[PDB]
Design a protein around this ligand. Structure first.
Ligand code: NA
Length: 164
C-alpha cells in the first residue's frame, strides 16, 4: 500500500465524466473538473487538462496522468501551507498518506480549517485526534471513506485498506 493505491481505492476509476459525491463533474481517479452545473463547462475543463478535444471520455493512461499530477499538487499544497506543513512534517509516512488523502478530497483550505484535529495529530494523541476528525461534515457525508482515513491516522497502519 501507498498513497496512489490508497486513493485509487477511495476514488475509483471512471473514464467518462461523472458526478462525484457532492454532485460535481469529475473524471478519472477523482479528478474534479468544476463545481459548475454546466456539463459544457466541465467538458471544457477536461479538454484543457488533457490538451485535446475529448468526447467527455479519456483513456486509462490519461486518467493516471491526471492522478499523478493531482497527488503531486496535493503534496505541494500541504508543503506551501503554513498550518499544514508542520503537522505533515511531524507525521510518519503512513499518516502522511492519510493527510494527502484528506487534501486530495477536500482541498488545502478545507483541511487547514481542521485546527483542533491538526493540533492533536501533531501532539500524537491519536485516539483523541480520531474522535475529533469524525466530528465533521466530512465524516457525515462520506463516513466509510472518512473512517478508513481516520483509522489510518489512529493506527499508522494500512489495516483499513487491507481486503480492499
Ligand atoms: Na470518486
Amino acid at each position: 500500500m501507498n498513497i496512489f493505491e490508497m486513493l485509487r481505492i477511495d476514488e475509483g476509476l471512471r473514464l467518462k465524466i461523472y458526478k462525484d459525491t457532492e454532485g460535481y463533474y469529475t473524471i478519472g481517479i477523482g479528478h474534479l473538473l468544476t463545481k459548475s452545473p454546466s456539463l459544457n463547462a466541465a467538458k471544457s475543463e477536461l479538454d484543457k487538462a488533457i490538451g485535446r478535444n475529448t468526447n467527455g471520455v479519456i483513456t486509462k493512461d490519461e486518467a493516471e496522468k491526471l492522478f499523478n499530477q493531482d497527488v503531486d499538487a496535493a503534496v505541494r499544497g500541504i508543503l506551501r501551507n503554513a498550518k499544514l506543513k508542520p503537522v505533515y512534517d511531524s507525521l510518519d509516512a503512513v499518516r502522511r498518506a492519510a493527510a494527502i488523502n484528506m487534501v486530495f478530497q477536500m482541498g488545502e483550505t478545507g483541511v487547514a480549517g481542521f485546527t483542533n484535529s491538526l493540533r492533536m495529530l501533531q501532539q500524537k494523541r491519536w485516539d483523541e485526534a480520531a474522535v475529533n476528525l469524525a466530528k465533521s461534515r466530512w465524516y457525515n457525508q462520506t463516513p466509510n471513506r472518512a473512517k478508513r482515513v481516520i483509522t489510518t491516522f489512529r493506527t499508522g497502519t494500512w489495516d483499513a485498506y487491507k481486503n480492499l
